[PDB]
């Protein structure tokens, strides 16, 4: 596994998240379900608890944006970069942005919002990319059955190394 340089970590364990907007490819429910299940993989392997707020200042804000979107790291249209996240911190820290131009799905067709969100959430929690091709934290996307999905061992090792 690989930790974000500088080892940034949340000095807190109950963190809140907020879904600022949705993608019209999927229903709101399915979007909300992908995010919830994505936060839970990490949750069952660490002491972190995740609470959703409908509005207000959450620790981790989630949003789908296009090209330029205020943070100096414009997305690039279809394919290529799918999403990105900010390491732990106050402010934009912890935030996860998804490319609004992608095809978001909840099947095997590219892309599956759950596998990508669970990936972004590791970064928001302080993990960098892993060189283990089987880890969720691998640089490039790959579909894995999601129905009864759980965190690969290399990723468990990773949040464990950070949070215990
Ligand atoms: Ca893209
Ligand atoms: Ca934040
Ligand atoms: Zn962004
Ligand atoms: Zn990544």
UniProtKB/Swiss-Prot annotation:
GO terms for biological process: cellular response to lipopolysaccharide; collagen catabolic process; endodermal cell differentiation; extracellular matrix disassembly; extracellular matrix organization; positive regulation of microglial cell activation; positive regulation of neuroinflammatory response; positive regulation of tumor necrosis factor production. It comes from the Eukaryota. Ca(2+) 1 binds at residues 59, 91, 93, 95. Glycans are attached at residues 14, 106, 148. Ca(2+) 2 binds at residues 76-77, 79, 81, 99, 102. Keywords: Calcium, Collagen degradation, Disulfide bond, Extracellular matrix, Glycoprotein, Hydrolase, Metal-binding, Metalloprotease, Protease, Repeat, Secreted, Signal, Zinc, Zymogen. One of its GO terms (cellular component) is extracellular space. The active site is at residue 120. Zn(2+) 1 binds at residues 69, 71, 84, 97. Zn(2+) 2 binds at residues 119, 123, 129. It is found in: Cytoplasmic granule; Secreted, Extracellular space, Extracellular matrix. One of its GO terms (molecular function) is endopeptidase activity. Neutrophils. Can degrade fibrillar type I, II, and III collagens. Belongs to the peptidase M10A family. The conserved cysteine present in the cysteine-switch motif binds the catalytic zinc ion, thus inhibiting the enzyme. The dissociation of the cysteine from the zinc ion upon the activation-peptide release activates the enzyme. This is Neutrophil collagenase. The gene is MMP8. The chain holds residues 99 to 262 of 467 of the full protein.
